[model samples]
Target chain A: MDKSFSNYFWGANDEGYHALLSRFSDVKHINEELRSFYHERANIEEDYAKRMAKLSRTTFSSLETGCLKESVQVMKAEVDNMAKSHLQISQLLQDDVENAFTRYAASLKDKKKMIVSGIEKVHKDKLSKHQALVKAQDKYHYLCKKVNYYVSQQNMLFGKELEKNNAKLNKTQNAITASSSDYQSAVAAVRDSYARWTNEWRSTCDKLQDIEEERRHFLKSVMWTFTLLISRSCFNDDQACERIRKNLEQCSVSQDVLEFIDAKSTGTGIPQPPKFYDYYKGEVPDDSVELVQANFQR
Target chain B: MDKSFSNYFWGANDEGYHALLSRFSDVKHINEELRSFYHERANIEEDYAKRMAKLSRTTFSSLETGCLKESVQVMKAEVDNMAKSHLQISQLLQDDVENAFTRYAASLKDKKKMIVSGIEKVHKDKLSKHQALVKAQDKYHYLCKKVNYYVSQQNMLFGKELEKNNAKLNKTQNAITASSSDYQSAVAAVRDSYARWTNEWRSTCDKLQDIEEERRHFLKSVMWTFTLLISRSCFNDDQACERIRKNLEQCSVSQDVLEFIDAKSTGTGIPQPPKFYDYYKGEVPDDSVELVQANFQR
Candidate 1:
């Protein structure tokens, strides 16, 4: 198996540890961007549906009543439904997909915080022990220097000087012996701290990897769902138009015009011209006219 | 056969003619609105594609190098293509569907104009003839009354008075005879005009109904094509996302993390603490330490 951040936890410095933590931050950033991508996509869908639906409704308003008109109405309603479906897609994306992403982001953040704080505590303790060991070494080295100076002057020294040098040497040697235990234990304590933190750090690396895998799966599934939503809406839109097409076959212009005639036609009778009548003779000019009074004609 | 507006053309007045003309304008209006609806729908698709592609591009920017990153890159490109497909749909709607509607709308306008002008000319001719017939009838009637008055006075007339009265009656009767021919011909002309216009009116009605039928068929097919175009884009979009999803399966979080580690790991070696050195007594302080200078001890 490929070794991850865990394999390099031992002997890695603070900056490297920070680099490891930030690595996951990069993952988080990508996930965040993905979330927004879906979010914006949903907005696009919703706006499209809104505009299209309004246009469809307005289109229907212009149509007159007929079989064709009925088909147009169906198209209008279908268009609205398609719009509603897209709105649903948007709602789901925002409510479910984005929410999941947000929750996962929070989890990622928490994981990083825990890792940083956990290792940080152990590192601080290790640094304190190392500092104490360095302090003790400094004190022991200074005391040894004093003994060396006092002993080296023995060839030219008086009795008081010799007695003081011996006392100082004895006191310095005892201090060195006393400091040795602290120094050795300090090394042990530092080692223990490194071991513990390194172990924890490795586990954190594994966790981060697992979280990233989970992220990939989550986002992938969300995307899959996204495709399905769009596909389904498309299916709906086509079916709606299909219904319009099918309905159009029943739209008969001859039938519609006949209906109009039945409703609006005036009588088929032609307007007849007036005939001349003679008063002195009590006669009408007809045999020349079909519509004249017989009494007047006589 | 179904009787349309044409079947009621005889004796129908001016208001009915105008109603017929207005009826076609209504058809035009409905079609115009349908064109715009498609136009607006195209806009919706274009805008949606634009926003989605941008979001995908931005999301890809946040990703680090890895299999998942590569997959994301693929997704980004696919998204752009899907956007492109929607843009194509917009273009087709504007260039093809709406343009066809506009052309057909112009055709309908020309058809209406021709019918209105043709029928208007014949109708004017018919109305003028009918008015002339009325004028002839009025003149003939007045002349007949003058003749009758002259004849009525005959019962009391002397020689010169009778002769003058007889002359007046003769003159009026002759004028009446002259007007009679005019009135009969006027009737003939009026009838002929009516017959001609009514015939033309019926044909125009049929033509208008035919045009309406054509419109129904035209719009229906355009809508059918519209649905197909949208369906195709959805398929493209789904396929694009499907590729993204499929590529995601190859994305391994552990592998990616290892790659990151391989690039950024510090060495696994622990930092050794500074060792203590004793400077005193030519024989080093090494009987208690394994790493002490023993040159002077021998």
Candidate 2:
């Protein structure tokens, strides 16, 4: 009974089941992390968008200045667009992607539980049926042995004594034959049960495999979408910045002037050279070739 | 006459006068350079301010979010204040500072021209006066020589006839004394005239020195004001950036999440670790100790 049950139930791919369970866990963890990443990214994007917008709105001179106004408007529009896109992507990540992952994980979990429980029940039933078959075979063997012993005794008996012994042997043989048939039926039932359980187990395993494949494909798509969404924000920022740079470059003002102002505003701490009026006649040598040469050497 | 005139005219501090003129040129050059720098700086600032404002106004998403809205408002106020201040400073620079410098330069140019013309006039006067003195001295010498010759002739005549010669000698002596007095009076007049011109020359030089001093003080003040205006802008920018950074730090969200988002957005391409479900039962050790060791090694 132990051997047959082991061949039927323990022979199943336990490792494969364990692996499938592990894969489900991995998928769940990945989804969780992905969700977190998206949330964090969304928050950051929103923060920057707000700050940038505020910066633009507060500086009144930009709006007041004729040359700058249009450029500012363009930049503001781009930033706003980017902010909207980020928000949308973030929402999608949280709602659509996350929800989809959750559903997928839940379904896989249910399927895993069902498969495990089904396999367990099949294993238990096979064990019980095998044990019953073993008991039936043992009973049939004992009955056959009793019928043979009674028949041998009839050969040794004579006349009325022999006839009575023969009749008893015949009755015992009939009982033995019925018991053998019962044992054979029990064996057949155990074999049939095992075959049915095996088929069910194989089907469950196939379903689990299909689920795992679906999970892989789903997770891959989710990851790809998540990456694409994040990249989109970056692309938007780049485009906005590019536009801003172009606008600045197109400004009608001199580049040096712009640089000077930018330097001053940013506290670059560059020192300005002395103006022409700052020069003293005596300090600067008279215009002479020798003086120029000396200066060059110095 | 030549010696006296040379003493009066050449003794003036001619080198000092040249030095003062050179100083004026230097001041003019310095003011021009400073004006250029200021003009350039103002234009650049205006350009940047306009672009920044436009950027803020265009980005719509920032205005929509709650946390972002407040931050944007704060930034807008700061930028607006900065714009007002910058505009005021720019206007002051262009109208007050540049205009003052222009007027100052004009005044200096006028003063320089006056000094040159005045020196030329004084030179002309000195030359004419010296020429007159030379003519007066030549006439006085010629008269003396004439008087001496006449006296010698009278002496000759007296030797010939004592009474007649005595009358002639007295007349000649009177003429000689008158001529001698005339030369002395001409010499005194030349000395007096030179003294007056010298005094005038000194006064003119003194006035020029005063103007140079005034220019120095004026330019110094102008530079101080200009530097202060520029520094104010820098200070404002620094304050604004500092405030923004502080606000960002005060954000309630976790930095790690923000960093993760930023990194992902920027395409650092950090690979995510395999989730739990990704693990195969055979690949992961069964024992906790081995698992811990393997994880630590990894």
Candidate 3:
């Protein structure tokens, strides 16, 4: 059930080893995905914060007065608070979560380098030496068989031919001893290499395990911070709205109506009816015609 | 204290009327500002929702298993819920708040047209007729003085010339009557128009009052909903984190280490040491060289 490597990458179980290597591919992907998640989340938070900041800057404070105006200011101030909180969230995500995850990604690559050496250099060297061991053992067995055949036909040979056969057997026996030690060297070298490769692989698995643990902790911490930010911001928002709700409670639409009317109303209404006097009545009746004649007498 | 325009736009107070018109301009702006507020807020909400949606659509669920994996799924699902809530908030802002404010902006324009008619058309008509009345009254007074001058010089005059003078007086007097009635009609027309405009202006004020009331309520409702959405989504987010937190509580890093080891481990550690046999010893000792000589003896 475990996707472990320490025990699996040994022997001819390149199957297990390759699977282990591939699992690290998935591990690298985890870092990338987590880094991307945090980065994007930070971006959105900043954007949202900026938008809130924009929304809060308004001319309403000057244009309005009374509880309604106060509520406007309250909303503005509260929204600004909201924006600040989001900005904090953005900063935290960027510095704490995103950057932290990025560090993990880089560290994984650095550790992966160690894994590469273990497989490519150390394990490969062990495999090459093992190949040499098999070759030497095979050649040594063939020579041994040939030399033993000459010994069995020693009696059938004469003078120079039998002496030549004896010399050939002695030479092959000596060569077989050299091959024996060469094979032993190869085998002993493989044993040393195998131990080295195993220890290296086990260290890699241990590191991966540590990485996994750290990843889980990072996720937990970041998520906790994320929710904390949201909850705190929401609590602040709710408080702001609570104030607005109370303001709204007292906001008298009718009174506001009266206020506008009072501010802009004209004290006078319904123009007075105009009266017109006839031209002669205003003048022709002036001391009658006599007054007119008197004015001529003067 | 009252800005009551019902009584003010009438009479000689053009100052009051213009102020009333200007107040309407401010009122129109209220609609526009509110419209812009809701519009931008909706846009931001939609953007935030889209970001959350994108964040939630992750492959973590498949890449992991057990409590940690389930927590990832929970976070994913809950974040999606958060996104959906934001989307709903966006929709509500667009439909209920933004669109509502937009309608107010349009309706204010329509109502402003009626106000223009009240001031420009109806009030202007009253002023024009009043000006005509003043002109007529001046002419009537001049005409009366001319007729009176004729009467004062009547005794010093004779037949043709006196008769000519008398005809002039009668003709002028006749024109005076026309002037008098014209003044009266002008005065009467002014009164009619004054009443008409006053009522219209009052109606405009009433409508504006209603609009202010509606606007206040609109703002209240929208703010309530905005806060509601944030609170609800945050609450859900906190619950999701609560699940994640519990999972984190159970997540044993050491145990996870063991699990990975179990799944991927090779089960073998420190490869068995290799041994090599001397090749000739394997063959020469086997059915020894003596047996080979014994075969020759036969």
Candidate 4:
């Protein structure tokens, strides 16, 4: 065959399995988009909160001033309005973010289930096909043996027949007389017929034997191909795992970073600034300590 | 690890994939027992059938003679009673044969189906297990990559920390006053503290690194073992087929053969002979041929 057997791990019939994987991929893609979208949205929400708090702080700080008494009221109204607007926007954004997160979570769970089910179905189908292929191959093997056996028997039988014919020819030749031209002519005719008959028999037998041999060869090739197909299919499981791993890596965050973050965050809090500085006995440079102080300002 | 991880093809947990193969073994103990049971029943039924048939023939042939004998009424009653008894016995024996045949047929069918279905179920289960193994292996591989990445990053961080410490050590050493014994002793104490801190830091890093590496290696080994298990499972399909083929070969006559015979014989105006025969000239031998007259009589 110009083309190998169509049955393969990633062949057309494995579309169902692929569909399951695609579902997982879709979930993963959605999750990634959602994670990015929500993280940015959270940042925006936190910024808005901070801005509102800052506005409140600034307005309260200005209230301590005696100048622009009506201006403070106007400023207060504006701040209140701005805070309400920002709150509404933040609420809407938060809701959208939560909804997307929920959908992504649900999709991930569904994808996990679908992947498991798909793997099972694919496995079952592959196994059944393997069993069937093996069965066909086994039958082919037996057929080859039977055909070979019959061919051998036929060859032996033909040999036996040839021996019988040779004996008959010898007996006929002995019985014929060569005293006259007529008898000699009769003997020549008999010899010619015998030669022709044996030649035809031998040719027919040889043809049948050749055909049988060809059939055996063909069957052997088919069986070998089947064996290879099965072995390749079995090995394809590794490739499937490799593909899954690649896809998973593409989808998920680096587990190592997550683990490190988890470990580091577990027992230790964020670094705090020193209350006071000791210069004489300290190892840190003066400029470095000043920089730390500047960043630690309330 | 020296031994490959695989259950044998003919194991009990193997789901009788090769159970039918026992039919083809040199001893064929199981099939021999079945055959013996069948033969014993067949002989009994055969003798009973023969006696009943012979009695019927004799009585039928003498029916007219018995009616004309002295006291025709008495003679008829006696003969009628004998005939009734003979018919009853004949029917009983026939029923016995039918029952024996039914049991035999049922057992063969059950055995055949059990072999086929059991093997098929195992194949299905194996496939499912293989698929799960693939997924687990994928996860394991992903975990490995993440752990390796984490390790490398941690190693870099350690290098940076060591650089910082080394720079601090150089500063301390450079600031030391060797001419003042007290200052020198203080510097030595500082050096000792730095050395102790560095040792503790390195040990902690090393310990965590070891744990991650060990976990990755264990997971990788599991994935490898699982892969081998799946490959071995797939190979069992072939072994099962071979076993089934060998079993089938041993059954000179099988349910399929018998059913084929029944279908072929029906409506053919063929008499049901007392014995089974093989006459069909195809994959199945002919089943209605009889022995030569001389051989039959003998």
Candidate 5:
């Protein structure tokens, strides 16, 4: 095969094959990145849920014995629910999302192998056809050169010597015609094989494009599912808060009762009316109460 | 009572009384602001707790059924605890913090009333003593004027008439001395009353200062408790994530199983070894498998 011809005909396909192979690494990279992202998100959610749970436990344990126990229980139930949702999402990330990506990576690997093999087959066929054309052309040219030499010898010869040379030349001419026919067929065969190989290469590229599109759609679907789960959980949280608020309002203690207890403990005295100035100066004989009454009566 | 004298001696105490009364409005404003602050805080906390409870519920209900159910249950317990804590904190704000501030407001009102009464007494005492002093000074001056007139008459009169005038002048002089004594005692009484009123005013101010300090300490304690609850919950959340990561590592599904299932579903062919360029053109191809085997054998 001619090295220059092979380079020109096959170089583009080689590049295409390399490009397709690069996708194997690309898919793997994406898979790793996606896995880590899911893992991180799951961990964060789990942590948040767990913290909320612990906070509830602390509140429950610290609460004084009272009618609020039922209220506390209601709150606990809500907290428990949130924790469960978080864990579920976390598990889904690990199992479903991660698994989907892993499977995609595997599919990508298989596609890479199939394309590489297909490209290799096309290369082999083109090389073989080119080599056949070259070999047939070389033989045909050698036969033509022999026939020209024989015909020249015949032109110089005459009589019995010329007749014998002419017969030998005719045989050489028949052999030349057969070799030419072989070369023509070889060229035709090479052209046919090249067309087929180019079509196959084009089809393989189209297939890879389709696969990439499918992969993109698959990834989007997974992401949509994740977002859906998160939003649903958030909506539930809003509802829980609303419920708790209503319940708390119903069971709230009176501010007056609280103030009375506070006063008894703090020993803050009752407010007194103004006394006459003489009272403070010891001119008034009675206490401030009687002095105030006497002065007011006056 | 002399209006000008009353204005001079009693005006300061009147102003003090007004000043003390003005503080009642100040205390009321502070009390209103504080009550609203506590109310708003309680509402916010209650809202937050309710939201947390709802979030838990959302999480729990949304979780898929699986072996992770036990893990979720454990998480639920933690979440329940946190919800309870949040509710407890909310209740504490209403029952303890709000109540404490209410009692403080009450104590402030009592202090205001006491100060107003005390200052009023001072004003009354100062006015009364000042009026007595004015009256005594007037009486003494009148007696002195009478003595001077009588002495003048005695000088102008003959023997018997002069002697009677002189005796009357002596009586008037004695009366002047007594009136002077009364004026001096009135001044001393006013000074003593003023001193006593000042001491009482100072003491009331000191009591208010002590109450304000107590309020500051109470507010600080409430804030500290809130901070402690938040930090503890956050710590628990961190622990939960750590534990989850460790648990997930132990129980994670294998990538191979996922890949195999993916292959079965997608019909992606098995991965193949790389082939030589010639193999692509189909020059000598039984299959890529044979080509790989031959290469390996070689």
Candidate 6:
């Protein structure tokens, strides 16, 4: 959009002047070149600041995430310990229930055997008095043996039921432990996520701040250079040129050119007069009034 | 769009023992700053280049059309001179034509007058011979006066026609000079436009080159930082840490911390080998050959 600045910077008409304008062409060429140099110098200085910011950021990021592996290990260990403990508690409960059921079933079977033996003994004692009684005692002993066999069978059946119940209890305990373990794991996951989220938030906040700072710095430089370049091209007097040159020098422009422009009384072509008004109203003059106005008019 | 970079750049997962994970956040912050810096820098640079380029174009255009003012002056002078010459020529030609027509008309008038006068003299002589011819001599004198009046009127008409033709010629010459001046002015305008255009093209090209160069340099640095950050974070072993610390130092990281990371091996946590691979495979065999053999058997 700003064709004047663009053209001067690119040296588009640094060649021969048309028609009767050869002398003017040379002057135009030199001015273009000089402006270009100042423009480029300003650009480089600003870029240097950007590069430094980038460097700082890259370095900071690389160093910050150094302990990821260790953090993962600790979290995993916590999950594992909880799960194992849960499993062990379940197995112990299962064993206790199974053992108790087995012992109770065996005790019931022994009581039934004793009852049947006693009945058979009583029947034999009564039968010693008569032949009829002896026949009855034989039948009674057979009956008692049958009863004992049934009772033993019942005891075995009861023992299996107890074992099954104990096994169920163990399974229930194991399930409870597993559920707890799962809950613990869930908590750990939440913790891990929280840690990550917090860290991320902090990191983001810090990064944003740095970016803002960088942007501000960059904007400042851009404004300064814009002013400098515009000034350098608009003015047509030695004093204006020198002022522009000085501002540009702070942005890395060379002093030799500044001095040259000053000595030769060539316009730096800096467009300062209007910009000065824009910047500070009519407070500033076209030339350095203090230094060069002794012999000049307003 | 590239969320992978943003993910790592923004994710600040500091799980317990690895508070250093926050470093990623630091880097991101720095990067944001840097990016802003570059963004501003580029804009300013571009502005500076453009302003200079435009100035150059205007200056060069002035040079290219510098002949316009002088050319116009010369043309005006030439036109004035030609106008003066044409005026002189037109006056001379009109005078010559008028003089010739007047002489011819006067000669005819004189001849007519003589003829009439001769008749009148003859009549007078006859009248002297014969006193009765006095009336005829008077009539002959009246005819001579009428012939003189008619010849003079015809000569005046011819002179008027000659003067009109001279005026037409002078008008034509003036028109030609005016058109010539217009053509020269048009040429000057064209020259100015051409010079401005050519200079603009050249300057834009130059600015583009500079922009490209600056962009390339910035890109190169950005890429280097990108790779550096990723690589440094990839490995956290003593060697890797040392390498990264040194690299960070070069980027303006605190020197002391960098050296501490480099020199103190015990304080740094070496990450556990990947469990899905190395750790799950079981404790690494003491024997190098056994380790190879175990994997082979599996």
- Evaluated at residue B151, the lDDT of candidate 6 is 44
Which prediction has the highest DockQ against the true structure? 1
lDDT of 4 by residue, B66-152 (tens): 112222223223323433443443344334422433454455555445445534454554445434433443443344344444545
TM-score per candidate: 0.84, 0.35, 0.74, 0.23, 0.39, 0.15
Per residue, candidate 2 scores C-alpha lDDT tens digits across A60-85 of 22212233445445555654564566
Off by over 4 Å in 6: A1-169, A185-189, A192-196, A236-298, B1-298
Can you write out model 2's per-residue Cα lDDT over B1-298, one digit (the tens) per residue?
1111111212122333354446556657756755554455455445545544443342223212233334434544554555565566667667666677777778778878887777667645655655665565555455555555666666466454755655655765576556556555655665565556555555664565456446545644554454455445545544654565454445332232233223322121111111111111123313221111011000
For candidate 2, the TM-score is: 0.35
Candidate 1 second chain TM: 0.80
Which lDDT tens digits does candidate 6 get at residues B1-298? 2111111111111121122223224433433544443343233324433433433232212321222223323322332332233233334333332233344344434543543443334323322432222233333333334444454555456576756654554554455444434434443444444334323323332332233233223333342332222222222122322333333233321232223223321211111111111211233323221111001000
DockQ for each candidate?
Answer: 0.30, 0.02, 0.26, 0.01, 0.03, 0.01
Q: Is the docking of candidate 4 incorrect, acceptable, medium or high quality?
A: incorrect
Instruction: Predict model 3's lDDT versus the native.
Output: 0.66
Q: Model 5: runs farther than 4 Å from truth?
A: A1-18, A21-24, A51-55, A59-77, A110-119, A138-179, A255-298, B1-298
Q: lDDT tens digits, residues A1-298, model 3?
A: 2344444344344455676667668777766776787688789889999988888785552566455666666666776887888888789779877787677778777877876766677668767876776676678678778878998989999999998998998998788777767767776887787667666656765555566677667666766676666666666666666766676677775676567556655545344445655657653322221111001000
Question: Least lDDT summed over 10 consecutive residues: which range in candidate 4 chain B?
Answer: B1-10
Off by over 4 Å in 2: A1-64, A69-77, A109-125, A138-178, A254-298, B1-298
- Winning candidate number (TM-score): 1
Ranking of candidates on TM-score, top first: 1, 3, 5, 2, 4, 6
**Residue by residue across B141-168, what tens digits does model 1's lDDT show?**
8888788799899988989999999999
Considering lDDT, where higher is better, how would the candidates rank from best to worst? 1, 3, 5, 2, 4, 6
Worst 10 residues of 5 chain B by lDDT: B289-298
CAPRI-wise, candidate 2 is incorrect
